[PDB]
């Protein structure tokens, strides 16, 4: 059912993590992370985080992961080893999926599972806010507040990014 979209997305989220955490060639490991990032945006979108979700696409996927793939093409791999051709990767990949499936199978059946900690299974929709009718995006109001409340956050973040430029040039000079 559509009421479980967030749970369904979070299930795919985990499989994507098993995909690259079993560590195939970093070409495919990067692909597994891109799919997890897209699913991660989907989860954040359904909790009302439109701006935060699109930052995942714009910054995490369109920025950081492009550079990861770019660097992989130069310094790591150019051709990939056949996916799952290694026993360790396949074993880890199969191990994660089965653990994930057993978690999902039981929570769905019981509407609650106890994987180490207690988790409900009624649906994520049940914890949502009930009354809302402001004429603005609260999520947008908070991020915009960075420039009126977070003077300190801007300064240290701005400084760190400038230092990142300086440092990376020092590191790579040789």
């Amino acid at each position: 059912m559509m009421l479980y979209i967030v749970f369904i997305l979070s299930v795919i989220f985990v499989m994507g993590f098993v995909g690259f955490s079993s560590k195939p060639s970093p070409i495919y490991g990067g692909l597994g992370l891109i799919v997890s990032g897209g699913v991660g945006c989907g989860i954040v979108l359904n909790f009302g985080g439109s701006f935060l979700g699109l930052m995942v696409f714009l910054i995490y996927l369109g920025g950081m992961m492009v550079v990861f793939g770019y660097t992989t093409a130069m310094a790591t791999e150019q051709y990939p080893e056949i996916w799952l051709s290694n026993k360790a990767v396949l074993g880890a990949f199969v191990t994660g999926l089965l653990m994930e499936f057993f978690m999902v199978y039981y929570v769905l059946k019981d509407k609650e599972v106890e994987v180490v900690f207690e988790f409900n299974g009624l649906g994520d929709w049940v914890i949502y806010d009930t009354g809302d009718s402001g004429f603005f995006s609260e999520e947008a109001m908070g991020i915009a507040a960075l420039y009126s409340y977070g003077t300190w956050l801007v300064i240290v973040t701005g400084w760190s990014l400038l230092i990142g430029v300086v440092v990376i040039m020092e590191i790579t000079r040789g």
């Binding site: 150019q78 990014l161 790579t172």
Partner: protein
């Protein structure tokens, strides 16, 4: 649902066109370091760091609605100047060269 339907249709159609492109009656019976400059790596990293500063600047259209305009404008200009400073640093350090 509408947006998911749109995305599904766009990429499903793309998938179909790609496969029919690959399939048709042919009527026939018979991991290392690229020799690639460090400069290109530095372009990617430079883009990334600037892309992170653009993320901090995107809220500006909303931030201009605040009543704390004096603080908002000072921090907005501060962030752009530091972005300009890092560009100046790369420039003077020969980081935007190709020779």
């Amino acid at each position: 649902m509408n947006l998911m339907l749109a995305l599904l249709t766009n990429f499903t159609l793309a998938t179909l066109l790609v496969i029919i492109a690959f399939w048709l009656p042919q009527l026939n019976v018979y991991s290392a370091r690229l020799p690639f400059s460090m400069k290109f790596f530095l372009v990617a990293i430079t883009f990334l760091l600037f892309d992170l500063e653009i993320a901090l600047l995107l809220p500006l259209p909303w931030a201009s609605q605040t009543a704390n305009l004096n603080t908002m404008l000072t921090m907005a200009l501060f962030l752009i100047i530091l972005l300009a400073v890092s560009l100046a640093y790369e420039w003077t350090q020969k980081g935007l060269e190709w020779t």
